[model samples]
Target: YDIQAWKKQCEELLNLIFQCEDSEPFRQPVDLLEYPDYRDIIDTPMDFATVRETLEAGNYESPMELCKDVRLIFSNSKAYTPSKRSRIYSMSLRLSAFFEEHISSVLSDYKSALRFHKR
Candidate 1:
């Protein structure tokens, strides 16, 4: 139940983070892969269906390369705006689930890596 609640909360936070003055983040036609930090989170936790559907609906590419590209974006950016910060926080929570379930075994190995990788 808590996981479900957390998922819902993350979705809400994502909605707020993505909200623009005149467009819907999910619905808008933008380069989804441009945001590496966001893509990494979206790609994790095995939400392939949602990610695929979202990208398909938006006519975007959902490839592993795109995810990696987004990761690179997060790497170079020194600071993010309020909205971007919220997006990162929301994504981090989702990523925590993935790290707990699938990546836990290698989590120790990547612990220090993740700190630097995250936005």
Candidate 2:
């Protein structure tokens, strides 16, 4: 319950992050794999999926909670963002902050799973 609303905000921010550099307005959240740009990082996570996909897969109470894996994908995604590096960095940082600082402990395992969300 603590992160109930914050989780929604995280989804909105995810969409905003893409909108920053992408000409296509803030469209609905879906498989980042559909985008060639993000596909570059797909191989990094092996079987990874976006928060939206994770939500679609099952009962993921907090999609933001999926950041544990998303962060690594995003962090490693840097190599792909060479064209829009600055905006990508800012986007990752903000997303990381929300998970590491905002609802971290709130949805963490025993309230202690956000430490890795750090840079």
Task: Give the alpha carbon lDDT tens digit for every residue of 70-98 in model 2.
Answer: 56555654555565547745565555554
RMSD of 2: 7.9
Best by lDDT: 2
Error of 2 at 5 (Å): 12
Compared with the true structure, all predictions reach lDDT values of 0.36, 0.48
Which ten contiguous residues of candidate 2 have the minimum total lDDT? 21-30
* lDDT, model 2, position 94: 56
CA lDDT, candidate 2, residue 30: 28
Candidate 2 vs. true structure, TM-score: 0.42
Q: What tens digits encode model 1's per-residue C-alpha lDDT throughout 4-105?
A: 222233334335434532112223323546754644443332233343344445533222222443233333221332454575444544443442343232
Task: Give all TM-scores, in the order shown.
Answer: 0.24, 0.42
Best candidate per TM-score, number? Answer: 2
